[model samples]
Target chain A: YDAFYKDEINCEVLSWNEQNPKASEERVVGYSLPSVNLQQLKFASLFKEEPSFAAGVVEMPAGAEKPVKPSKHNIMSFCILQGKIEVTVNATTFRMKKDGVFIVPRGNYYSIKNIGKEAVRLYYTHATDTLENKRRGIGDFPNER
Target chain B: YKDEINCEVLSWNPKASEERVVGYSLPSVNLQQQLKFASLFKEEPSFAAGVVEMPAGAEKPVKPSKHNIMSFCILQGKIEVTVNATTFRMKKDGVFIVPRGNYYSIKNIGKEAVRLYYTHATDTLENKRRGIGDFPN
Candidate 1:
């Protein structure tokens, strides 16, 4: 499964200077001036299209009713970075506070509601079969309600 | 080593993988619940997630596999990921990556359970001209 496997080699911390504006995206769903900060790390990779995998962090607004249509590609896994969230997938609900991780597999309708003070920070990634999401805004979540 | 694991979520074990030499945080293809009920792509295992735990005195036995642009985001406590020789003293929300072909090791330097959320991708752009392809540097 591993090609040209180099069990030992060089290493460097990638300097993320590219995509200054995409450094962060925000939705005006918080009660404060700004609360939702979703960062697109845009990993440095060779694949130009769809990225094989893409990752980001979101500080879920404590007050919002926006529901995103389920992922169209692979699993949308969420790792709770901070606070708490009640996620319901396929009519089943579970609470994921700090340190909890869950995978919402494809074809499952899901809903996430932030449940604590300070936005429920989360790190998530997606795998799919598409490309150039330059105009993609927050995974197609309806910005309001 | 995989037989030691006793559940679908891997929540108790945190790391389990029978097929791969290295352990995994995600469930295997044989995890009954995953195979029969919740699996979206049963025929092909596309991608997976990992929850790496490193405590105040814990170390993840040197896992080096073609590095190939791996990203790590720290969630709790102080943890350091040494790539080649550069070690990142990561904080709670810090996210960093190890470029392709880099050897890396992870260790915890904090008091609590240091959790890391990471994903390893399997796709490669083998057809593309990878930086001065065919020409020796």
Candidate 2:
């Protein structure tokens, strides 16, 4: 019952490069990546020795910089719940609208920007890197089968 | 460079199972038929995330194995989630986690469709393939 309610946790404000004035003000619930503009509220986790996967709501207001730096050890997936945004990976960019799902491969450099007139909120999950197929990189599937 | 990011809209509806199996076949616990599911990300052996749509007046079990965890957020409608013996109501934007060995059940008590965005993590490649909807390749 305690796990079902999100208000049971604290709103922790975590930041990187504490001396820098450019760090954006962000508050999180459970855990977060080292980023200035991205705000993540962790709502669930499967606990083993470590979390199997941590799930949360990731938010980025309009005009914020890219969320996290390139993650070399975790694979990330997101389902857009709010406004439209543009996601750039390596040298290519893709338009992500509401309800659209996107996966960012580990070790890839990517940037996300809210291109619309509203804040971007997304349902996201992050999992540790898999040793089986890092070479597969990204798996882009169409909406319809 | 264009081959890098993976993005797509999920195919889902309240009557998804009646039309056809929206996703691969998997075992069900309490419902007469399995729920409708669509994979958003399933390439890595460590994790899998997807969407599931449950029609109105439906009940299903939430079971997580010893090495895996299941977390989900409600995308639509209202549901009564009973974990162990306690029950709670969750609607849109509501998120919860079922840790290993904790049993739970979900019932759609609302008039509208209940949609969920789910993510699962396992320790092995075999578990990853068999865990979420059992993708048949």
Candidate 3:
């Protein structure tokens, strides 16, 4: 529904690969911002190379449970599009409804559980970068200011 | 005791240089509640006008005259917009637009606050040179 900027932004629609043991039968889309302006990442760059972010729509089958542990270098933001999902972050667990958004900042341990009778659909965005040296912490965490 | 409530309306202002541009803040509510409130309309049509919400206890700015290439259609909330010497109160979902040279400003009035969304095109080559101005009646 919108124009795709190839020069400044490179986007690709990714499909779920069955080779991945934890992501069987799920759909995923990937998009990258190649050579993003340093100013944009100035607030959160621990290294010289600019960070890259990707978003995907994930559909978890009913009764499915996530196996792989969350990454320490990536930040994940999830928006539930349909069905319900039981998400566990650290020791706390929360049930996310349709259209609900949840953010998993870097270094936070998290996983997903399909709690609904039907499949759970979610839209997620992830950014890779070091959080220690970055002026801004890793990923899109909630900001009060 | 809670009760169900629903309402809708369509309105416009013809006065020129109406000072109706306002600003408002979003409430801290669940995303489901926000979408439910916005889903009052079956089909959210694309409007040529811009919608604005002004919060309480804020001063409305002077009418903008230099920029006049956008049309606005309000969805909800109340605002006091002035055009020339005429000052009036615009209620919830009241639609208005300032054509080229028409000045306007807005002030909000509500306890829980107001919310609105508008669409307009800028004068860019990609937009096919479409001038930004209020929509014609």
List the lowest-lDDT window of 10 residues for candidate 2 chain A: A27-36
Q: Better model by TM-score, 1 or 3? A: 1
- For model 3, what TM-score is found for chain B? 0.44
lDDT of 3 by residue, B1-137 (tens): 01111111111111122221111111322123211322211111111222234446444576553322323233345555554334555443233333223345555654534544332222222112234333551
Mark the 10 consecutive residues where model 3 chain B has the least summed lDDT.
B1-10
Flag regions of model 1 displaced more than 4 Å: A1-50, A129-145, B1-44, B67-69, B124-137
lDDT of each: 0.46, 0.55, 0.38
Model 3 chain A poorest 10 in a row by lDDT: A40-49
The TM-score ranking, best first, is: 2, 1, 3
Q: What are the per-residue Cα lDDT tens digits for candidate 2 across B1-137?
A: 12224332221121122111112111121222356776655744577877788989988876534445667767677788765445666666666655544456888988898877777876454344435334462
Query: How many clashes show up in model 2?
Result: 0
lDDT (tens digit, per residue) of candidate 1 on A59-137: 6566644374565445566666667667665555566566566665543456788766666666666654222122232
lDDT leader = 2
DockQ of each: 0.12, 0.12, 0.02
Candidate 3 stretches greater than 4 Å from native: A1-50, A130-145, B1-137
